[PDB]
Scaffold this active site. Structure first.
Site, PDB file in Angstrom:
ATOM      1  N   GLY A 150      67.471 -22.180  19.467  1.00 37.82           N
ATOM      2  CA  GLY A 150      66.162 -22.151  19.528  1.00 37.82           C
ATOM      3  C   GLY A 150      65.195 -23.221  20.012  1.00 37.82           C
ATOM      4  N   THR A 151      65.513 -24.338  19.334  1.00 37.53           N
ATOM      5  CA  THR A 151      64.807 -25.805  19.649  1.00 37.53           C
ATOM      6  C   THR A 151      64.936 -25.873  21.170  1.00 37.53           C
ATOM      7  OG1 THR A 151      64.361 -27.977  19.163  1.00 37.53           O
ATOM      8  CG2 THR A 151      66.308 -27.124  18.572  1.00 37.53           C
ATOM      9  N   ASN A 176      81.227 -23.074  27.351  1.00 39.25           N
ATOM     10  CA  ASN A 176      82.107 -23.434  26.640  1.00 39.25           C
ATOM     11  C   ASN A 176      83.362 -22.996  26.387  1.00 39.25           C
ATOM     12  OD1 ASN A 176      80.454 -25.446  24.731  1.00 39.25           O
ATOM     13  ND2 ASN A 176      79.271 -23.779  24.681  1.00 39.25           N
ATOM     14  N   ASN A 201      82.273 -32.233  23.915  1.00 36.30           N
ATOM     15  CA  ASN A 201      81.467 -33.430  24.089  1.00 36.30           C
ATOM     16  C   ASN A 201      81.929 -34.720  24.808  1.00 36.30           C
ATOM     17  OD1 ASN A 201      80.003 -31.328  22.675  1.00 36.30           O
ATOM     18  ND2 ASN A 201      79.572 -32.563  20.803  1.00 36.30           N
ATOM     19  N   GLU A 249      69.977 -38.263  45.188  1.00 40.34           N
ATOM     20  CA  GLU A 249      70.793 -37.540  46.142  1.00 40.34           C
ATOM     21  C   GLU A 249      71.135 -36.204  46.256  1.00 40.34           C
ATOM     22  OE1 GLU A 249      71.295 -38.441  49.420  1.00 40.34           O
ATOM     23  OE2 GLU A 249      71.418 -40.710  49.152  1.00 40.34           O
TER      24      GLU A 249
HETATM   25  N1  GTP Z   1      79.156 -27.898  24.256  1.00 43.31           N
HETATM   26  C1  GTP Z   1      78.886 -27.904  22.942  1.00 43.31           C
HETATM   27  N2  GTP Z   1      77.865 -26.731  22.785  1.00 43.31           N
HETATM   28  C2  GTP Z   1      77.558 -26.648  21.537  1.00 43.31           C
HETATM   29  C3  GTP Z   1      77.754 -27.594  20.609  1.00 43.31           C
HETATM   30  N3  GTP Z   1      77.425 -27.567  19.359  1.00 43.31           N
HETATM   31  C4  GTP Z   1      76.466 -26.270  19.505  1.00 43.31           C
HETATM   32  N4  GTP Z   1      76.669 -25.946  20.661  1.00 43.31           N
HETATM   33  C5  GTP Z   1      76.322 -24.600  21.387  1.00 43.31           C
HETATM   34  O1  GTP Z   1      74.670 -24.504  21.002  1.00 43.31           O
HETATM   35  C6  GTP Z   1      74.434 -23.044  20.790  1.00 43.31           C
HETATM   36  C7  GTP Z   1      73.395 -22.687  20.083  1.00 43.31           C
HETATM   37  O2  GTP Z   1      72.419 -23.879  19.755  1.00 43.31           O
HETATM   38  P1  GTP Z   1      72.855 -24.989  18.799  1.00 43.31           P
HETATM   39  O3  GTP Z   1      72.962 -26.248  19.493  1.00 43.31           O
HETATM   40  O4  GTP Z   1      73.979 -24.624  17.963  1.00 43.31           O
HETATM   41  O5  GTP Z   1      71.498 -24.905  17.889  1.00 43.31           O
HETATM   42  P2  GTP Z   1      70.037 -25.317  18.577  1.00 43.31           P
HETATM   43  O6  GTP Z   1      70.244 -25.497  20.128  1.00 43.31           O
HETATM   44  O7  GTP Z   1      69.390 -26.631  18.028  1.00 43.31           O
HETATM   45  O8  GTP Z   1      68.953 -24.137  18.165  1.00 43.31           O
HETATM   46  P3  GTP Z   1      68.628 -23.984  16.845  1.00 43.31           P
HETATM   47  O9  GTP Z   1      69.692 -23.457  16.049  1.00 43.31           O
HETATM   48  O10 GTP Z   1      67.498 -23.113  16.579  1.00 43.31           O
HETATM   49  O11 GTP Z   1      67.989 -25.376  16.102  1.00 43.31           O
HETATM   50  C8  GTP Z   1      75.796 -22.291  20.736  1.00 43.31           C
HETATM   51  O12 GTP Z   1      75.758 -21.661  21.727  1.00 43.31           O
HETATM   52  C9  GTP Z   1      76.737 -23.156  20.701  1.00 43.31           C
HETATM   53  O13 GTP Z   1      77.989 -22.916  21.595  1.00 43.31           O
HETATM   54  C10 GTP Z   1      78.583 -28.620  20.805  1.00 43.31           C
HETATM   55  O14 GTP Z   1      78.702 -29.634  20.113  1.00 43.31           O
HETATM   56  N5  GTP Z   1      79.140 -28.732  22.176  1.00 43.31           N
HETATM   57  N1  GDP Z   2      81.568 -48.368  59.053  1.00 42.19           N
HETATM   58  C1  GDP Z   2      81.166 -48.088  57.595  1.00 42.19           C
HETATM   59  N2  GDP Z   2      80.248 -46.732  57.416  1.00 42.19           N
HETATM   60  C2  GDP Z   2      79.861 -46.727  56.412  1.00 42.19           C
HETATM   61  C3  GDP Z   2      80.245 -47.874  55.205  1.00 42.19           C
HETATM   62  N3  GDP Z   2      79.421 -47.210  54.234  1.00 42.19           N
HETATM   63  C4  GDP Z   2      79.034 -45.869  54.608  1.00 42.19           C
HETATM   64  N4  GDP Z   2      78.890 -45.656  55.707  1.00 42.19           N
HETATM   65  C5  GDP Z   2      78.371 -44.572  56.638  1.00 42.19           C
HETATM   66  O1  GDP Z   2      77.149 -44.404  56.124  1.00 42.19           O
HETATM   67  C6  GDP Z   2      76.894 -42.868  56.382  1.00 42.19           C
HETATM   68  C7  GDP Z   2      75.865 -42.705  55.318  1.00 42.19           C
HETATM   69  O2  GDP Z   2      74.752 -43.385  55.453  1.00 42.19           O
HETATM   70  P1  GDP Z   2      73.965 -44.443  53.938  1.00 42.19           P
HETATM   71  O3  GDP Z   2      75.054 -45.482  53.624  1.00 42.19           O
HETATM   72  O4  GDP Z   2      74.133 -43.315  52.775  1.00 42.19           O
HETATM   73  O5  GDP Z   2      72.586 -44.701  54.772  1.00 42.19           O
HETATM   74  P2  GDP Z   2      71.435 -45.010  54.043  1.00 42.19           P
HETATM   75  O6  GDP Z   2      71.605 -44.199  52.502  1.00 42.19           O
HETATM   76  O7  GDP Z   2      70.183 -44.539  54.457  1.00 42.19           O
HETATM   77  O8  GDP Z   2      71.511 -46.502  53.388  1.00 42.19           O
HETATM   78  C8  GDP Z   2      78.302 -42.462  56.293  1.00 42.19           C
HETATM   79  O9  GDP Z   2      78.295 -41.582  57.344  1.00 42.19           O
HETATM   80  C9  GDP Z   2      79.164 -43.233  56.164  1.00 42.19           C
HETATM   81  O10 GDP Z   2      80.432 -43.159  56.918  1.00 42.19           O
HETATM   82  C10 GDP Z   2      80.972 -48.812  55.407  1.00 42.19           C
HETATM   83  O11 GDP Z   2      80.992 -49.760  54.691  1.00 42.19           O
HETATM   84  N5  GDP Z   2      81.338 -48.973  56.750  1.00 42.19           N
HETATM   85 MG    MG Z   3      69.889 -25.681  16.475  1.00 40.25          MG
END
Ligand code: GTP
Ligand code: GDP
Ligand code: MG
Ligand code: GTP
Ligand code: GDP
Ligand code: MG
Lengths: 427, 426, 68, 43, 426, 428
Positions: free
Chosen positions: F134-135, F196, F218, F244
């Protein structure tokens, strides 16, 4: 450069009761009255090794006054600086303004005259009162009137305690507050509001004190007063004196009501937990969750701001912060003031009192701003004066004391003109 | 011989002047006790310009500290080089201004300026040949601007023939220190354009920009900003105090820089300014100095000269240098940037060289450019002034003290036609 | 309130550079009517004297329009 | 150990992180008087 | 005299630049702390082209590192030979393009290019006579391709008479890093064909095959690929830094390679590249260099030259060699494979010799052939661009940054008539 | 460069508990808050020897938040961040989006505000929630709406947990998931699905735990998050930031639902069994038996794919493996996307949590791809939503809590339009 602080009423002298404890602790003065020269702004040095404060605690009920005379600070305060009547004013503005004032105020102003004569570089007066009482409001107004005819041009920084919207310890306090404002308009130069509800809120949120008494309220109000008088006491990189707020914050002769705030109010846990820099405390000073008056400045538009800083602050970051605040849009100014801030920096960090609940922080900010949310406060206050007065309630007590019924009418229309003022000035 | 009487008004002026007398005493080798302890006897021959011998090697400054509150004075007397000022020179009020130009020019000036004039007169006829007066103050505050301005007007009425410098910091919109910044700045500039001989504008933004881009400091306290301004003031008066290959006095600089009697607002710079992290990667050559000179990031004013044209400029070089490199660099920078220099004035750059660099350096310089881009700053101030004056905010704390509205309207007309004539000559 | 162009420091006063990270106030920056229109620009020159829009004690005169 | 006076060379300690305190002393003060007041400069 | 300033854009550019300055630094014998430690005198006189003597034997490179994220800068600053750059030459941002060419050319360039232009302009006027600018970037990324593209455009607007090299890596589908590779490549090439004087096309697919087959390395890290590219760049500008029997500057190679102003995309090789086990069984003769130089399996591009015609070619040799063997090998290679050379240009090979080999080797070579098999790679990108653009995939990202559709139509038109004119001259 | 994490709900803050234990282990931070500068992207060094995370656990039921407040990491988190309500929203999107959210969300976002203000180089936000509850659904969506109107263009990684098809814990969770997705459409930049049942199958098959609790789920989810932020934290041969995935994975402004997968999820004895190399782990990151979402991509067409690699891996072999994948015809890419891959390499290998079930490995892969199997999932969900909605079951709760029928109808038809969108995008 000496400033004398007068306290009127039950609240006034209880705030000063904490304020002067802070002052003696900051200047290293023992409760006896002698050290074991920056103190000269507060304590006159008499004879040889004896410091007697520049203040007058005046009240009508002798209870809290002679409580001071018997408490820890018997020797510090001058015997005659504490002035006390014989019978209370009893939440009655007229009773405290016409019946009891006519015998207590002439003695008081005669006393304050020879305090000013002992003074050398008098900066101004700063008054402490609550407008809920009859003492603080009635002869508080009478004292300010006779002070304005006595000196006039010297500033009178007024730190008043207005009644809260719902939290209240009186019934006739709307009558008292309105009739006090009707004179606080044309007498006070700069008036700062302090609501006890908002301070309760801060004590709950930040200091996490679940059950605070009036002492914690008085203690952090003392921190605020110390933080905005620190420029006079200690040297800073950019200091700003008492007679400055008169010029930087009051754009019009009848618009002077300032929403005070402070930051960081923090506990001993969150201080150890959080990094305290200048940026976040400048932000935290603007969040209405940290203002001393219950209003919402987001509901209005700022007129002018003033930022007192203490501790370790270099100008680059405070100016960078002011910049950030100018770029944000969660808060917006009126379309008049492109230069909406008044910065001020002092070197000394805030001091802690052993037994206080504030932690020791390297830096602090005290913001004294101006907005139109104060015009929202006076509207809410005027509504619950309008409710009670429509049915002629409680008028009997005031008429018996001696106020003519017209006082009520002209005070209501004076507030109405004040609403128009905020409405047009904010346009 | 040539004498410079130094006057400091207000908080900004008092603290800058505190660092200024620190730097000057360090250049001449005078210890903070007041005795000479230098090494080369070049430092004796020119301390009459800035000091007076009292009793047996006791040199006291020729300065007048004037304000209304002792707060700045006690911050001065606390730090080092505090016990060297003459106690009779601390002319001093008692009330306080409060960012109120009217209070600093009409109510308090009328009982203080008489005693200030007595002190500055005594210090004027104490020496033989005045070179000029030199005031450092602010344009935002009240006790600096207002009181300084009335002093400038009275002095210019008394000694109209000697030079006059005004080192004044100006307000910026984003460092908006006071709320009545335009009400004070506009009135003060309206006084400086008919009374001051030449004005050097300073701004805290340009100083922060310098401290963070060139210096790259971490905690730039006001001590460093005041130090930057002090180095500029020392670099100005350097040519009087030390002999050079090409001497340039203050009057010599004014006649080269001011083409028209109203265009005397200079933006200043200083070089070399490098971080201690990059002091290993650079070299110290005249081209490396002049490249840092004409950079827009090295002005001490919040007005990009690239937005306008340079009318005239000056460069005061210090140290053992070669005048061929000096003139060649000024000629190159003039031919390469043909757009930023005005067309109807050939050789827009005056240059001079003194042979004594500041302690610890090999070669330094000081740039004084009379550009036209300063009209953007005056636009910025005048616009804010009209914004507030249309709706009469904060006006009554001036109107109630004696001022009228016509002073504000006249301040507007003089600011507005001055920016009109800057735009005309551009 | 309005924030004017600094022409040297606005490169450092960009909101993103000041850790604002939200959509910034450009209301304050459009009210200028600069030459370029962006924050990098030159203001317009102004001439003449400003008459009094407001009456005394901050009350708009009847002729001038206002937002209600 | 000797160091130049040039801008930015010396970085002062903040001194407020320590408990120092910066009380300023009234070395310049007026003398009690009526219309006429005399300034006094002390050591 | 002749000067080459270096600009590094983006992640690939910054790491290529780090290895490139490491290679040059011991080519001239300077230690990573920045002092000279070589033996021969022939290393001293020609480091004005790349370095600046700062103070007491400190040689800093003449480079401008440039990107948006500090990850690449800190990866540079960590390793050795990383503490030699001046910190003033590092221009960085706080956002990141994120392989968004629109971000790298309209939003972030708008506030960074002013400062990048100031640092490159300072580094260009610090010297006397520019030879050319030298940029290393990618054609897939955002902050490398996009901003490097904008900077190229602004520089060529400012300094149109100076040379300009662009070492740009292009993508392949097998080595396909960015998903929007065609959207970046097409727009960047659309700019490079009107701004860059010449572009030396690299790609990582061919580098992998080289370290797989030829070097017989087991795990080729990016450091070795970046070392291949740096040895190529060193081989390009060895003739400026070292005396030879037949000199060849960058402009000399440009005029000899580019017959028409738009046909300036060069495929590159380097020899000798032999496995450490097979170094024992070989000889060292000019035939042994050219037989490996002209191999299609040694070009550093994914363009098989025997699929098209070699328009022009160039070979830069290093070491004490006999020009008769050099020119005869160039003639023989031209006479045997006579169909792979264009008919209406006789003697299609420029050749030059330098006397200083890379340290540790006796003889080396560098090949810069301008063939018409490069339209293979441009079509290989153009079809992918129009494939995505028929459905307008990924287009919102580019459009939101203020780029319109006509920019894409013009980019594709420039790509199409360009490969049309390669097909014409083939 | 910083990125902050907000956790909305029971599942949200349990996954966050796992994540922050992991981060402390990766940066060597003792649980009391101090080491015995890579941490600067998650913890802000306060004062001297204290690190507070950049996160807020917000939840309506006080039980689990108070459990955190009294757990082992009392000192690590600082008590002003753990926002805890008084009474639950109780599996009720309406109650969590109109009744209680409108009081809690302002404090939540006003804490986020000053967290971001403390931040310097903000890469993005990342939200952790299960939309079944709910929340996490209701005021999760409310917080995302007001967060988008506060920031707008910043990347917001939403690592959401959808209800599994046949194994489920609640009944109204179809309503909750539909009404959550209707806003997750137009407010999330990049949304990652995590059912899950798929994780249960993984733990049964690979890690051979026959009876797993939520800590294992978790834990591997935290491993995935760590693997996709290790490019920001540690230096790689080819790094990739958070913004990105914003560009390289979402072709159209409404299709952002990404199947996540991981490899190698291998126990200790099987790690003793098998050699770990880039070719086979890249192959392993592509079968349905190693995805985090119970769907079969055999039936789908890949739109794009992002491959984070950690540890002892060089680019030559990732090139080889991507090549051979593109040559194999068991999986096919969409027509208009020829370059469907994005590699990324990071040097630091994934760590181990003591007591965790995953063995330490030389290298690992984290794939975030995009296909049409999600368009299959949403129809499988719309079916069982219309089932209950045809008779107006459970609608009285929401209508009494403050919605109306128009919102149900518009969410239903919005998912229908999304189905049509997936069809037309898959159509060549
Ligand atoms: N992955 C994961 N899911 C969880 C966990 N605990 C509860 N859930 C999921 O949370 C969903 C229901 O919401 P809850 O987190 O239990 O409670 P809430 O989200 O706070 O909502 P309220 O009960 O109204 O307060 C269920 O579908 C559970 O599967 C957890 O520890 N891990
Ligand atoms: N030769 C070389 N190319 C690189 C290296 N790191 C990233 N690249 C190239 O850079 C490209 C991605 O660009 P990016 O680094 O993200 O540019 P920017 O985000 O604008 O700084 C990819 O195609 C990579 O092949 C490196 O250490 N050596
Ligand atoms: Mg709850
Ligand atoms: N902030 C603060 N307000 C106080 C304190 N003590 C009393 N008050 C306020 O006092 C107000 C009522 O008037 P009082 O101050 O009690 O009385 P008074 O002003 O002396 O007037 P009289 O009661 O007529 O003598 C209420 O609004 C209280 O909140 C205190 O310690 N701090
Ligand atoms: N550089 C520098 N500027 C200062 C200093 N103190 C104040 N200022 C500047 O003075 C301006 C306000 O002037 P103010 O101090 O009120 O002048 P005064 O009150 O009349 O003396 C502000 O903009 C500050 O930037 C200082 O120590 N150094
Ligand atoms: Mg009382």
């Amino acid at each position: 450069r000496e400033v004398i602080s007068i306290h009127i009423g039950q609240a006034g002298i209880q705030v000063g009761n904490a304020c002067w404890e802070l002052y003696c602790l900051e200047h290293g003065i023992q409760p006896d009255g002698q050290m074991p020269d920056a103190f000269n702004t507060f304590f006159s040095e008499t004879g040889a090794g004896k410091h007697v404060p520049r203040c007058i605690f005046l009240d009508l009920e002798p209870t809290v006054v002679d409580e001071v005379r018997t408490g820890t600070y018997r020797q510090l305060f001058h015997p005659e600086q504490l002035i006390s009547g014989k019978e209370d004013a009893a939440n009655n503005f007229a009773r405290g303004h016409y019946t009891i004032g006519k015998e207590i105020v002439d003695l008081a102003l005669d006393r304050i005259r020879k305090l000013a004569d002992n003074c050398t570089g008098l900066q101004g007066f700063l008054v402490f009162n609550a407008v809920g009482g009859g003492t603080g409001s009635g002869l508080g107004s009478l004292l300010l009137e006779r002070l304005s005819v006595d000196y006039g041009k010297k500033s009178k920084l007024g730190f008043t305690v207005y009644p809260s919207p719902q939290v209240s310890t009186a019934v006739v306090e709307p009558y008292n507050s309105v009739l006090s404002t009707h004179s606080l308009l044309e007498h006070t130069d700069v008036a700062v509001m302090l609501d006890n509800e908002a301070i309760y809120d801060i004590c709950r949120r930040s200091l996490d004190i679940e059950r605070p008494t009036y002492t914690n309220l008085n203690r952090l109000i003392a921190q605020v007063i110390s933080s905005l008088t620190a420029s006079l006491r200690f040297d800073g990189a950019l200091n700003v004196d008492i007679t400055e707020f008169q010029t930087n914050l009051v754009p019009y002769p009848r618009i002077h009501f300032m929403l005070s705030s402070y930051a960081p109010i923090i506990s001993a846990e969150k201080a150890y937990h959080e990094q305290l820099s200048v940026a976040e405390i400048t932000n935290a000073a603007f969040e209405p969750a940290s203002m001393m008056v219950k209003c919402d400045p987001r509901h209005g538009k700022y007129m002018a701001c003033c930022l007192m800083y203490r501790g370790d602050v270099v100008p680059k970051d405070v100016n960078a912060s002011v910049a950030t605040i100018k770029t944000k849009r969660t808060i917006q100014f009126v379309d008049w003031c492109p230069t909406g801030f008044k910065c001020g920096i002092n070197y000394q960090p805030p001091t802690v009192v052993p037994g206080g609940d504030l932690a020791k922080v390297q830096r602090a900010v005290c913001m004294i701003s101006n907005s139109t949310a104060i015009g929202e406060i006076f509207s809410r206050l005027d509504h619950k004066f309008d409710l009670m007065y429509a049915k002629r309630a409680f008028v009997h007590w005031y008429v018996g004391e001696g106020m003519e019924e017209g006082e009520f009418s002209e005070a209501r229309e004076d507030l109405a003109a004040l609403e128009k003022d905020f409405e047009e000035v904010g346009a | 011989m040539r004498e410079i009487v130094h006057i400091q008004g207000g908080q900004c002026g008092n603290q800058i002047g505190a660092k200024f007398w620190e730097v000057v005493s360090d250049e001449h080798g005078i210890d903070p006790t007041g005795t000479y302890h230098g090494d080369s006897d070049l430092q004796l021959e020119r301390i009459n310009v800035y000091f007076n011998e009292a009793t047996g090697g006791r040199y006291v400054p020729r300065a007048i500290l004037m304000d209304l509150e002792p707060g700045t004075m006690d911050s001065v007397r606390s730090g080092p080089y505090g016990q060297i000022f003459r106690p009779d020179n601390f002319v001093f009020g008692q009330t306080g201004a409060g960012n109120n130009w009217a209070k600093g020019h009409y109510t308090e000036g009328a009982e203080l300026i008489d005693s200030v004039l007595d002190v500055v007169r005594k210090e004027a006829e104490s020496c033989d040949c005045l070179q000029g007066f030199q005031v450092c103050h602010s344009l935002g505050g009240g006790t600096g601007s207002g009181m300084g301005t009335l002093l400038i007007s009275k002095i210019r009425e008394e000694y109209p023939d000697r030079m006059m410098l005004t080192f004044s910091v100006v307000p910026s919109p984003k460092v908006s220190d006071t709320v009545v910044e335009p009400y004070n700045a506009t009135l003060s500039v309206h006084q400086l354009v008919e009374n001051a001989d030449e004005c050097m504008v300073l701004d805290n933004e340009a100083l922060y920009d310098i401290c963070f881009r060139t210096l790259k400091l971490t905690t730039p306290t006001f001590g460093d900003l005041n130090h930057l301004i002090s180095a500029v003031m020392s670099g100005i008066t350097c040519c009087l105090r030390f002999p050079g290959q090409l001497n340039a006095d203050l009057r010599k600089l004014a006649v080269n820089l001011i083409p028209f009697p109203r265009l005397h607002f200079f933006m200043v710079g200083f070089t070399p300014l490098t971080s201690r992290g990059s002091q290993q990667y650079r070299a110290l050559t005249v081209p490396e100095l002049t490249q840092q000179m004409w950079d827009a990031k090295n002005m001490m004013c919040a007005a990009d000269p690239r937005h306008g044209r340079y009318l005239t400029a000056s460069a005061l070089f210090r140290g053992r240098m070669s005048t061929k490199e000096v003139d060649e660099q000024m000629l190159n920078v003039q031919n390469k940037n043909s757009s930023y220099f005005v067309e109807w004035i050939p050789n827009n750059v005056k240059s001079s060289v003194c042979d004594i660099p500041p302690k610890g350096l090999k070669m330094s310089a000081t740039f004084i450019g009379n550009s036209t881009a300063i009209q953007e700053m005056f636009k910025r101030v005048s616009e804010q002034f009209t914004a507030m004056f249309r709706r009469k905010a904060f006006l009554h704390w001036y109107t109630g003290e004696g001022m009228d509205e016509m002073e504000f309207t006249e301040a507007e007309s003089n600011m507005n036609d001055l920016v009109s004539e800057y735009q005309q000559y551009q | 309130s309005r924030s004017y162009p600094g022409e040297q420091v606005e490169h450092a006063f960009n909101s993103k550079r000041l850790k604002n990270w939200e959509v910034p106030a450009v209301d304050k920056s459009q009210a200028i009517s600069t030459s370029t229109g962006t924050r990098f620009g030159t203001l317009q020159p102004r001439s003449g004297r400003t008459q009094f829009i407001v009456d005394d004690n901050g009350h708009l005169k009847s002729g001038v329009p206002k937002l209600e | 150990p000797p160091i130049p006076k040039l801008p930015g060379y010396t970085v002062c300690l903040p001194q407020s992180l320590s408990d120092k305190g910066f009380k300023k002393g009234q070395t310049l003060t007026y003398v009690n008087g009526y219309q006429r007041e005399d300034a006094l400069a002390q050591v």
